Design a protein around this ligand. Sequence first.
Ligand code: GDP
Ligand code: MG
Ligand code: MG
Lengths: 198, 346
Amino acid sequence: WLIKEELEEMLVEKLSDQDYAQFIRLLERLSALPCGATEEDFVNRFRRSIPXXXXXXXXXXXXXXXXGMAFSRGEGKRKTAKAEVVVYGQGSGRIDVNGVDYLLYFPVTQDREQLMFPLHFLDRLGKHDMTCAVSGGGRSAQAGAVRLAMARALCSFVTEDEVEWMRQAGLLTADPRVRERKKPGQEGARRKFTWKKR
Amino acid sequence: XXXXXXXXXXXXXXXXXXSLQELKTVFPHGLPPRFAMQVKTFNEACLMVRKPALELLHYLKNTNFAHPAVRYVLYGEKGTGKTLSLCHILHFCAKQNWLILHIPDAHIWVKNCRDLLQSNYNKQRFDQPLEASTWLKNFKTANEHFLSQIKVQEKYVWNKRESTEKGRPLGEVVEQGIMRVRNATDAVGIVLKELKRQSSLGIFHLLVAVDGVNALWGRTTLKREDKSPIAPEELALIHNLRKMVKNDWQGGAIVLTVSQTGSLFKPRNAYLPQELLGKEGFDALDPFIPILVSNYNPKEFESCIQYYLENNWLQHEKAHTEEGKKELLFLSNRNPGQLERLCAYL
Ligand SMILES: Nc1nc2c(ncn2[C@@H]2O[C@H](COP(=O)(O)OP(=O)(O)O)[C@@H](O)[C@H]2O)c(=O)[nH]1
Ligand SMILES: [Mg+2]
Ligand SMILES: [Mg+2]
């Protein structure tokens, strides 16, 4: 149904909430009965239509000319740190980061687990071969950016169904969480200078 | 996996075992602490055999003792298993009844020495009694038979009131260096030079194994009371130990190793020989055999997992699936030292 503002525009008249409510109530009474032709037109005046769109946008794959092989290139961004991950569809399990091996670039076990997440999800763990370039921020931020980029580059080689799973696993959604600016007259953006009653 | 003794080619990625008395005999010195844990835990001393270990051992089978001393090198990534691939050699050629001179970490010499003693007998060299004494005390139990046999032809002065004159068994020298600790280092160097002198004879078959050779030419942590840092040159132990890598002599074999872990002033990621040794090190090290050490391959890996399952050391429920294998494979990048740790808490 129209908003209150749209009926206000249609009649060139200020309205009250109660009034709007009364009317819409009446249009429900109208829809409640057998619907004639002019009846339907009438209620169509007060009808509007709204869009809804949900799909993770699917990149068509890209077959490289050199080996004749297909790859997909993802970009994740988390918290001062961006990563790009090219995933090759036929792998040895090789995963290279900034030109060095992923074990050496993430000596923190936790990070390697984060990395393992999408691949262990899609059971592809050995199947794929990834090249990686990441910059900005500290280690966990980096491992997470690679998580996002990878899980993004992994939806070319996955089935249309597993995509909604990765969404509900929350893999492809960015982390909105970031540092909050200190505020002046305070300490930590939240933390305040110790307050004195006396 | 089935085994009998160290040397077999087709037994690549199989489990070799040793006894506890074999262990106290062959490694009186340190065994890698993670692996000493493995052993004291499982009651059984167990190992697997690797392609570089096989390679090295086959080079050691073809050896000519008429030829000058040959240098070998084990290099590789952190925790990639290069110190144990030294011990394979160790107990092989110790069961072949050789002289085993084993220094587990050279780094303990160059770093963390409580007592730096000044000795001008050697023209400004410093002696480290703590290390000397420990090393000798292990070396005693190392080779017993050979100690009574060796007859040193020299005159040696411990003190104004103490001396030993030629015709003495070497074990005497050693244990007399242990009893009086202050001069233990001097006795170490002496044992060394006379070891190299007697290596000319067919009685000495010498395997000199120094792990963490980088320590020899590396930059040193230890310091004089003037706060002035002291060279690796200034150390009695080291100066004498370089003499043992020099390839001047016959009948011996020197297996060497370049560590990252125990080192000083080196970055964490450098596994390459020229880096760790540097100019002085590489140059003074002469042609050697650069043996690469790397990660477990898939077979060695499912072998390691086989072995860990066999001991029921994996206590997690889901560890038995192919899932567990894929996880441990991907978290470790199938690296020996990494998998060791991933299993420890699993
Ligand atoms: N089963 C088996 N385990 C090994 C072998 N070599 C090393 N390891 C284990 O893997 C770990 C790493 O070995 P190490 O030589 O100390 O690596 P490093 O720190 O690079 O010198 C050790 O704790 C050993 O217990 C081997 O040949 N077989
Ligand atoms: Mg704060
Ligand atoms: Mg080591």
